[PDB]
Structures are given as C-alpha cells and as structure tokens.
Amino acid sequence: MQVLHVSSEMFPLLKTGGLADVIGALPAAQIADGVDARVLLPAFPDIRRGVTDAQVVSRRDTFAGHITLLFGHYNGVGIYLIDAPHLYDRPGSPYHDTNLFAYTDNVLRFALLGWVGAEMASGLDPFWRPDVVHAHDWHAGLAPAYLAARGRPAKSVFTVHNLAYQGMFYAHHMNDIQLPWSFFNIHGLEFNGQISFLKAGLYYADHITAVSPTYAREITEPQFAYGMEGLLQQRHREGRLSGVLNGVDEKIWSPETDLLLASRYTRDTLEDKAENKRQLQIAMGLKVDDKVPLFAVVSRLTSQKGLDLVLEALPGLLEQGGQLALLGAGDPVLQEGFLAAAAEYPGQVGVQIGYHEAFSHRIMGGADVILVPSRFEPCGLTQLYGLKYGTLPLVRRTGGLADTVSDSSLENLADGVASGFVFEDSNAWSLLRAIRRAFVLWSRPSLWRFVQRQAMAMDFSWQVAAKSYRELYYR
Numbered sequence: 001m002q003v004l005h006v007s008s009e010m011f012p013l014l015k016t017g018g019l020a021d022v023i024g025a026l027p028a029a030q031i032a033d034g035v036d037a038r039v040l041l042p043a044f045p046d047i048r049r050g051v052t053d054a055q056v057v058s059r060r061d062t063f064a065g066h067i068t069l070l071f072g073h074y075n076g077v078g079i080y081l082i083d084a085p086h087l088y089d090r091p092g093s094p095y096h097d098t099n100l101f102a103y104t105d106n107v108l109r110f111a112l113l114g115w116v117g118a119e120m121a122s123g124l125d126p127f128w129r130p131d132v133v134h135a136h137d138w139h140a141g142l143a144p145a146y147l148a149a150r151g152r153p154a155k156s157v158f159t160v161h162n163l164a165y166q167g168m169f170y171a172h173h174m175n176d177i178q179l180p181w182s183f184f185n186i187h188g189l190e191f192n193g194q195i196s197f198l199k200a201g202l203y204y205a206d207h208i209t210a211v212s213p214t215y216a217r218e219i220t221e222p223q224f225a226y227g228m229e230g231l232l233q234q235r236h237r238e239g240r241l242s243g244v245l246n247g248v249d250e251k252i253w254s255p256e257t258d259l260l261l262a263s264r265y266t267r268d269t270l271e272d273k274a275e276n277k278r279q280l281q282i283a284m285g286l287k288v289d290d291k292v293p294l295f296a297v298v299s300r301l302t303s304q305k306g307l308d309l310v311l312e313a314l315p316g317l318l319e320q321g322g323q324l325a326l327l328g329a330g331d332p333v334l335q336e337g338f339l340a341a342a343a344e345y346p347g348q349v350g351v352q353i354g355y356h357e358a359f360s361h362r363i364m365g366g367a368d369v370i371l372v373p374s375r376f377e378p379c380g381l382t383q384l385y386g387l388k389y390g391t392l393p394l395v396r397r398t399g400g401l402a403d404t405v406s407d408s409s410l411e412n413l414a415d416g417v418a419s420g421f422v423f424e425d426s427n428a429w430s431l432l433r434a435i436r437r438a439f440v441l442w443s444r445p446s447l448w449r450f451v452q453r454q455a456m457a458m459d460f461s462w463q464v465a466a467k468s469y470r471e472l473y474y475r
Helices: 020-032 108-122 144-148 171-175 197-204 213-218 229-238 270-284 309-318 332-344 356-364 382-389 399-404 410-414 426-440 443-458 461-475
Strands: 002-006 036-042 054-059 068-072 077-083 134-135 155-160 194-196 209-212 242-243 293-300 325-327 349-353 369-372 392-396 421-423
Touching: 002 108, 002 197, 002 325, 002 461, 020 036, 020 077, 020 134, 020 461, 036 108, 077 426, 108 134, 108 144, 134 144, 144 155, 144 197, 155 197, 171 194, 194 197, 194 426, 194 461, 209 213, 209 309, 213 382, 213 399, 229 242, 270 293, 270 325, 270 356, 270 443, 293 309, 293 356, 309 325, 309 332, 309 399, 309 426, 309 461, 325 356, 332 349, 356 382, 369 382, 382 392, 382 443, 392 399, 392 443, 410 443, 421 426, 426 443
Parallel strands: 002 036, 002 134, 036 077, 134 155, 155 209, 209 242, 293 325, 293 369, 325 349, 369 392, 392 421
Antiparallel strands: 054 068, 068 077
C-alpha cells in the first residue's frame, strides 16, 4: 500500500508544533508495518538543507508559479519537496514576516501544497503514485478538495492536529486556487462567509481522524467544535470520523537512552531514577529530600491546560507535604500567581517561566508525578512521556488523557492496569482528591513501584499508530 503524507513541516528539520513529530515519526513506523509511506513538504530552506540527495522529478508551471518537484531521502524515508523559491525561500517563520504578520500570499502557498498532493495521486510522478493521500492539518486542507475535483483518483484521509487553526482566507480567492466554483458552498469549503482549508479537508476527505479516540467523539459536541459541529456529527453518523492516538519516539523520549539525564534507568532499575530527582530538586531550588513526592508541570500556562486549577489546589498539595516544580509560559495572570507561589513557598515551589525542551527531559526524568489537569486536551502527549518515564500522570478524564491513563483504583491495582491518577471534573476539589490519592499511593512505596512498572510497560509507540492507520487505510 502507498500513502503519501502531505504536511507543511517535519521534525527535526523544521518544527513549530507537535504535528511535526508525527510527520517525522509515523512514516517510518508505517514502512516497517507493510505500508510504503512517503512525505511531501514545501521546500522551506532548512527543510531543503536536510535532503542532501534530492533530485528533480518534474519541472512544471502552476496556478502559483514554477514549481520543481524534487525527491530524496531522510533517515530512510522518501521525501518530496516542492521547490518554489518565490513562495518558500524566506527567512524567518515559514508562516510570517519578521514583523509577525502572515504572508498575504499564503493562500497561494498552501493551496500549492494541497494541489501537489492531489497531483501526486494522478501520477505527477511517473514511478510512484499513492493509493491514499494522508493530508495533515489546514496547511494540507485543500488536498482532499483537489482530489475531489479529480474524481478521487486516490483515497484520502485527513487528520486534524489543531481544530483551532481554521486556515481562513477571503472568498475572492476562489478565483486563484483553481477548484470548481461549486465547492465554495456550505456543503464544501465554505465556512462563515470565507474559504477554510480546514472545512475543505474536513468536508472533502474520504475519512477524518483526530489525535485520540475520545477527542474524536469530543469534537462532535458544540463546546469543542470551533463551529464545525454540524459537519463533524454527520461524518460520525456516516462512520468516517475516528481518532488515532499519537505515538512517542523512543529514540527521543525514553529513560533508557536519554543523554539529557543525570542518570539513565529502566523499568527494572527505578532506583537509578533517584539522582535525576535529587538533581532536579537542586536545579529548581527545592529542598533535596526524597521522602517526599515531587509533582511537575511542563506546559503552556493557560486555562485550557488547567493551571488555574493547579494554582487553586497548590496550598492543599503543599499542606500535605508535596512539592511542585513548574516549567512553562503563557497567560500573565498565571505566571504571576506561580511566581507569587514560589515567593510564598520557597524551597517547595519552584517555577521557571519560559520554554525549554532540554530541561523538560530533566524534569520528566526527575519528578514523581506529572500534572496534566486539562479542561480539554487536543494533543495528549505530555502524559505519555510521564508514563514512559515512570513518572505517574495525574490527569483530567478528557481527550487523549481519558484514553491513556488508568486511575489508581483498587480495581485497576488488582488487575495490574492502574498507571496514574484521574479526576472527572474541572474544579479544584476533584483535582485535590486525585492529589490526595497520589499521596496515599506514595505512602505505600511498593505499590508506587508496582504502578510505575505498569505505566512504563504500556505500548504507546508509533508501531501502534501505524497498525491503526494501516487498518484504516484498508477500508
């Protein structure tokens, strides 16, 4: 089977969001799983620097200028690049000028991405054509549309990584992107008076995907849907809306090999995790002290994430002996409160304001618990890391989290399935209850170790996502 992924970025060559890890990690899983997967990306400069061996496949004109299709490999997976300097050769963020405004011609720039995707399905490359074009997020949102206009030469699945970015453009661009006029219709890429690459992808795709089974069900509810509820419910009725959980690259994230840690450890050497802790408390300003549970937060500081809730809970958490190390940024109000808390409880509350992937690993590897109290969770990733590192996640029961963590109930404990802590409601009382639960578990160290081994044993690798999508593709 032959899938072609169409996105706008790919770890590690270029990344601005979690989407790029998928594109960077899924296709290789697929390759090893019976699916011949390839990737089509704009030829952004540092996307291009990475593919040393690129060679020409075709030189063509376009409704947006001279493209020249290249092909080479990267870490063993086939990459196609749309070489189009007037469009793609730009320093700064591939999405905007130094002055932080989008590139006005962006519509042309990503319609192009879609169109090449669709063209691939019609044989733009004489040696290889995809059975399925897998389009990814609004950037590739038109690919399922161009496909439709070509009477669906290959099947298309579109996954939404960010229901939030609608990919809006003015209606009068209909005259530039070369799709059938009829497509600009509420039943089609029309959305609140404008074009929407997303509504496009959402409407035209043979089948749609969200990043988790439940967030898949979730977005059919109007609270979640950013106004796409109608379409979504329908695709659901029809059975062309499901969720597939994303994966975790063992190569980057994994306590056995993580070169960022004071000490690597395994599921049956958890005694080795202790220096990692010690070091963390140290590095963060916290009483070095192992008799006590260290709760971490590594997240954008926002309401969606639940940190207002963490802040309300804080005093209680501290009251019962715990400590908190936080690493993130976002809403001012929150930043204040957490600094205030550090000031108020120096030694047991330690707060870094900012962002820092290297340091997050040291956190992920030192902490005892990882707090993910989301009001809703589009990209349930943090908690997978926790599980993988044996640092038990405490999470709200929503999106990916609801699919990924097992509460430390007696049931789950005896069934050897418990892997963390869960709370139902989005208020501080219920969070506190899970916090309480954590201490109670903590105070029975052998059980704690029991649950960590369980967390660590769970398979949330890409090989899993691969199977899932493989199966999808054959339908």
